Design an enzyme around this catalytic site. Structure first.
Site, PDB file in Angstrom:
ATOM      1  CD  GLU A 186      -1.997   1.252   2.160  1.00 10.33           C
ATOM      2  OE1 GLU A 186      -3.143  -0.094   3.039  1.00 10.33           O
ATOM      3  OE2 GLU A 186      -2.722   1.744   3.620  1.00 10.33           O
ATOM      4  CB  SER A 212      -9.606   4.319   6.506  1.00  8.14           C
ATOM      5  OG  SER A 212     -10.812   4.100   5.379  1.00  8.14           O
ATOM      6  CB  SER A 272       0.642   5.796   6.474  1.00 10.91           C
ATOM      7  OG  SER A 272      -0.310   4.321   7.398  1.00 10.91           O
ATOM      8  NE  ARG A 275       1.712   3.536   9.029  1.00  8.17           N
ATOM      9  CZ  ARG A 275       1.226   3.352  10.283  1.00  8.17           C
ATOM     10  NH1 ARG A 275       2.412   3.497  11.535  1.00  8.17           N
ATOM     11  NH2 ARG A 275       0.034   4.368  10.407  1.00  8.17           N
TER      12      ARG A 275
HETATM   13  N1  LIG Z   1     -17.559   9.455  -2.276  1.00  7.46           N
HETATM   14  C1  LIG Z   1     -16.160   9.566  -0.776  1.00  7.46           C
HETATM   15  N2  LIG Z   1     -16.984   8.219  -0.396  1.00  7.46           N
HETATM   16  C2  LIG Z   1     -16.705   7.772   0.800  1.00  7.46           C
HETATM   17  N3  LIG Z   1     -16.157   8.908   1.100  1.00  7.46           N
HETATM   18  C3  LIG Z   1     -15.622   9.838   0.984  1.00  7.46           C
HETATM   19  C4  LIG Z   1     -15.791  10.226  -0.088  1.00  7.46           C
HETATM   20  N4  LIG Z   1     -14.601  11.086  -0.801  1.00  7.46           N
HETATM   21  C5  LIG Z   1     -13.957  11.740   0.571  1.00  7.46           C
HETATM   22  N5  LIG Z   1     -13.960  10.962   1.211  1.00  7.46           N
HETATM   23  C6  LIG Z   1     -12.950  10.566   2.544  1.00  7.46           C
HETATM   24  O1  LIG Z   1     -12.445   9.637   1.929  1.00  7.46           O
HETATM   25  C7  LIG Z   1     -11.568   9.038   3.091  1.00  7.46           C
HETATM   26  C8  LIG Z   1     -11.013   7.994   2.030  1.00  7.46           C
HETATM   27  O2  LIG Z   1      -9.656   8.471   1.863  1.00  7.46           O
HETATM   28  P1  LIG Z   1      -8.940   6.971   0.803  1.00  7.46           P
HETATM   29  O3  LIG Z   1      -7.726   8.101   0.273  1.00  7.46           O
HETATM   30  O4  LIG Z   1      -9.836   6.670  -0.028  1.00  7.46           O
HETATM   31  O5  LIG Z   1      -7.892   6.087   2.157  1.00  7.46           O
HETATM   32  P2  LIG Z   1      -8.806   4.218   2.051  1.00  7.46           P
HETATM   33  O6  LIG Z   1      -7.777   3.622   1.076  1.00  7.46           O
HETATM   34  O7  LIG Z   1      -8.689   4.253   3.901  1.00  7.46           O
HETATM   35  O8  LIG Z   1     -10.659   4.571   1.330  1.00  7.46           O
HETATM   36  C9  LIG Z   1     -12.923   8.956   3.546  1.00  7.46           C
HETATM   37  O9  LIG Z   1     -12.729   8.091   4.977  1.00  7.46           O
HETATM   38  C10 LIG Z   1     -13.885  10.619   3.590  1.00  7.46           C
HETATM   39  O10 LIG Z   1     -13.109  11.151   4.745  1.00  7.46           O
HETATM   40  C1  LIG Z   2       1.366   4.889  21.751  1.00  3.25           C
HETATM   41  C2  LIG Z   2       0.091   4.252  20.627  1.00  3.25           C
HETATM   42  C3  LIG Z   2       0.235   3.876  19.532  1.00  3.25           C
HETATM   43  C4  LIG Z   2      -0.765   3.571  19.065  1.00  3.25           C
HETATM   44  C5  LIG Z   2      -0.127   3.783  16.794  1.00  3.25           C
HETATM   45  C6  LIG Z   2      -1.215   2.592  16.224  1.00  3.25           C
HETATM   46  C7  LIG Z   2      -2.456   4.093  15.897  1.00  3.25           C
HETATM   47  N1  LIG Z   2      -2.309   3.600  14.163  1.00  3.25           N
HETATM   48  C8  LIG Z   2      -2.026   3.465  13.256  1.00  3.25           C
HETATM   49  O1  LIG Z   2      -1.421   4.150  12.771  1.00  3.25           O
HETATM   50  C9  LIG Z   2      -3.227   3.417  12.356  1.00  3.25           C
HETATM   51  C10 LIG Z   2      -3.978   4.736  11.369  1.00  3.25           C
HETATM   52  N2  LIG Z   2      -3.937   3.503   9.849  1.00  3.25           N
HETATM   53  C11 LIG Z   2      -3.327   3.775   9.062  1.00  3.25           C
HETATM   54  O2  LIG Z   2      -1.796   4.114   8.724  1.00  3.25           O
HETATM   55  C12 LIG Z   2      -4.013   3.263   7.495  1.00  3.25           C
HETATM   56  O3  LIG Z   2      -5.663   3.102   7.779  1.00  3.25           O
HETATM   57  C13 LIG Z   2      -3.818   1.683   7.669  1.00  3.25           C
HETATM   58  C14 LIG Z   2      -4.191   0.640   8.285  1.00  3.25           C
HETATM   59  C15 LIG Z   2      -2.831   1.604   6.837  1.00  3.25           C
HETATM   60  C16 LIG Z   2      -5.104   1.352   6.483  1.00  3.25           C
HETATM   61  O4  LIG Z   2      -4.387   2.476   5.018  1.00  3.25           O
END
Ligand SMILES: Nc1ncnc2c1ncn2[C@@H]1O[C@H](COP(=O)(O)OP(=O)(O)O)[C@@H](O)[C@H]1O
Ligand SMILES: CCCCCCCNC(=O)CCNC(=O)[C@H](O)C(C)(C)CO
Ligand SMILES: Nc1ncnc2c1ncn2[C@@H]1O[C@H](COP(=O)(O)OP(=O)(O)O)[C@@H](O)[C@H]1O
Ligand SMILES: CCCCCCCNC(=O)CCNC(=O)[C@H](O)C(C)(C)CO
Lengths: 351, 351
Positions: free
Chosen positions: A121, A175, A178, A190
């Site tokens: 990813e 969502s 990173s 990262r």
């Molecule tokens: N059309 C859409 N539907 C759902 N989420 C959207 C949309 N447009 C923007 N977003 C925002 O984009 C985020 C998802 O981003 P994205 O980079 O695609 O991440 P992921 O890989 O986690 O799906 C959502 O959490 C929301 O805040």
């Molecule tokens: C001392 C407390 C430390 C807590 C550390 C854990 C915090 N959590 C994270 O970093 C995950 C955030 N999310 C992501 O990176 C992404 O959504 C992916 C899961 C990669 C999928 O796109």
């Protein structure tokens, strides 16, 4: 077969497709009807089924990829709706990244003669980003910032040149979040992340306001005043907290005025939507700012679909980084938003 | 006059009072009736008016301060209710810190012959903390941690010795959050802070659940499952994201499952209260962890009233720091909670 890169994320599927435009006569026959019908379906529609969307405005035209001229298309739909995509396919090498490349692997395999090639990813993010910047957005810059970010009648989207980017901090706000420190094309880490990301914004908004989509959440937010929900430094101090440079207008406690019944009764949905946006965005900016300083990086590129059609958040990030660092840090953004992983996956095809 | 230190914060007023216990005969006459009545009111009641509370269990007995033996008392009430405190007073040198020392200065001056001595909020925190640790909690340690924090049938509050503390990271979780790196008694910096603090917890909880107090918010939380609201790494990946060490159980997107209508309809208030607690606490732990590593500090002391009677948050912080750093970082806590600033103010009296 057709060229795809697919990034199956926690909320959205991103799909990059390479439409060939240099097909010879001897290649148009040799093309099978199944391939011709997928090509034509993709390029003749901008809406697919009820939730698939082609972002026409992002199309890269006359790109040369793997020895071929074509147009690069950008398509998204909810991950939720992936079974319909798979049904279509079964009713090719697929380079797939994001979490769903693993989660839904068995589902992809229901497509009889499909070879799934899983890719990382964050690898794809970085490869995609650098590639899109290197080809340009049809002659225009892929990267931009907000000039004079701390003066909001003067603040303006302006192009930024990324030709020698390293070191770069990359903040991927989907969502979740990173944060990468990219030191060369092949060397990045990262540094950290946060779970308070795009999903938190819309998740809390929906619960607080009854909004049922990202776009409606931004629209409510545009009408809201986050200082109705938020307790400011001036609410505690009666002014600036001078000693540690916290101006009276800075947020002391996000949603902190919502501990009072009277305040909860006077606050609007729009106010709460804006406070949600402000809280999520500033938290991210604050963490990015800290990683930048600690990594000795002065350019921070924010990407991912949290920021799609979201100027409120982009400007707030630009303002926050510029103000709190007194110009030493610049917030950068990229025209192709959240599609970089999908492009990166596509770029893995000849391997 | 009576010895007070007062910390007027964004949510609560903290009041430390020194009750003298070595009064000679020639001192009991010379004491004026007004002073005797304040002394007796303070020490004969544990509830003052409708919202004032004396935390009897925290009382330090037979302390010597400024050449005098006494007991040190700890009292809190909502900042909101400060006008009643002032009315009492007018119906002495006051060492006052926190934001309200400035905001409410004019109000204090309505007490005819009152001299207000304003002191800095974070100065008093550090002075108070170090002082309380140095005198002990009636022979017992003021500082503690959770032994074996990553094994929750084995996890146990145990005493921790702070005799040579430096360098120490101090995380003050009140309405908002300040994070200090303390390098000696007189040398510290505020490394960073976050507005997502105690006020955000109760502010969002109240809005999401209808709870009307901190304590009710914790009670709902105790019954809740935060994984109903939160989107986990395993929800995206179908397991661990191995490459970057994110186990399937880690939160990917806080409240991220609340983007789906079906999920919003099945989630409980208790689930949302717990998700609010988990989200606020982990965010703070994540930032503290990062400042610790970057400052080269391996002990992190968390204080402030967000953590008062809040074992869920304290253990989660202890677990998070221990797990994610593989034992290199320790979360520490202090028995006197959020009272350090008030003590620090009191310690400024002879100046
Ligand atoms: N059309 C859409 N539907 C759902 N989420 C959207 C949309 N447009 C923007 N977003 C925002 O984009 C985020 C998802 O981003 P994205 O980079 O695609 O991440 P992921 O890989 O986690 O799906 C959502 O959490 C929301 O805040
Ligand atoms: C001392 C407390 C430390 C807590 C550390 C854990 C915090 N959590 C994270 O970093 C995950 C955030 N999310 C992501 O990176 C992404 O959504 C992916 C899961 C990669 C999928 O796109
Ligand atoms: N009885 C209480 N009333 C209000 N808030 C409380 C109470 N007990 C604990 N809290 C928590 O303590 C926080 C305030 O902590 P404190 O350290 O006193 O900060 P401040 O100086 O900002 O008031 C609140 O935001 C809340 O989360
Ligand atoms: C790049 C984005 C950077 C954003 C930087 C601003 C973030 N806000 C803060 O640090 C204030 C947090 N609150 C506090 O410290 C405390 O509540 C006090 C106000 C001291 C009163 O006790």
């Amino acid at each position: 077969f057709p060229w795809f890169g697919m990034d199956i994320g926690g909320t959205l599927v991103k799909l990059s497709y390479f439409e060939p435009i240099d097909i010879t006569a001897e290649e148009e026959q040799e093309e099978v009807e199944s391939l011709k019908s997928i090509r034509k379906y993709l390029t003749s529609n901008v809406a697919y089924g009820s939730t698939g969307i082609r972002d026409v405005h992002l199309e890269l035209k006359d790109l040369t990829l793997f020895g071929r001229r074509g147009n690069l298309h950008f398509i998204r739909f909810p991950t939720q709706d992936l079974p319909t995509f798979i049904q279509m396919g079964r009713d090719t090498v697929l380079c797939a990244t994001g979490g769903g490349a693993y989660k839904f692997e068995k589902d992809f395999r229901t497509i009889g003669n499909l070879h799934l090639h899983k890719l990382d990813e964050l690898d794809c993010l970085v490869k995609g980003l650098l590639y899109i910047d290197s080809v340009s957005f049809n002659g225009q810059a892929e990267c931009y910032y907000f000039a004079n970010a701390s003066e909001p009648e003067r603040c303006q989207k302006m192009p930024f040149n990324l030709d020698d980017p390293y070191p770069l901090l990359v903040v991927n706000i989907g969502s979740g979040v990173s944060i990468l420190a990219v030191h060369s094309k092949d060397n990045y880490k990262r540094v950290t992340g946060t779970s308070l990301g795009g999903g938190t914004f819309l998740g809390l908004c929906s619960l607080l306001t009854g909004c049922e989509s990202f776009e409606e959440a931004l629209e409510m937010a545009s009408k809201g005043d986050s200082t109705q929900a938020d307790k400011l430094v001036r609410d505690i101090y009666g002014g600036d907290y001078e000693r540690f440079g916290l101006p009276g207008w800075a947020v002391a406690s996000s949603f902190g005025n919502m501990i009072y019944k009277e305040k909860r009764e006077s606050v609007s949905k729009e106010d709460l939507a804006r406070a949600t946006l402000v809280t999520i965005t500033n938290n991210i900016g604050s963490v990015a700012r800290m990683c930048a300083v600690n990594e000795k990086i002065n350019r921070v590129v924010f990407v991912g679909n949290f920021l799609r059609v979201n100027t409120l958040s982009m400007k707030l990030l630009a303002y926050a980084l510029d103000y709190w660092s007194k110009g030493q840090l610049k917030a950068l953004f990229l025209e192709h938003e959240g599609y970089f992983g999908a492009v990166g996956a596509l770029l893995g095809l000849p391997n």
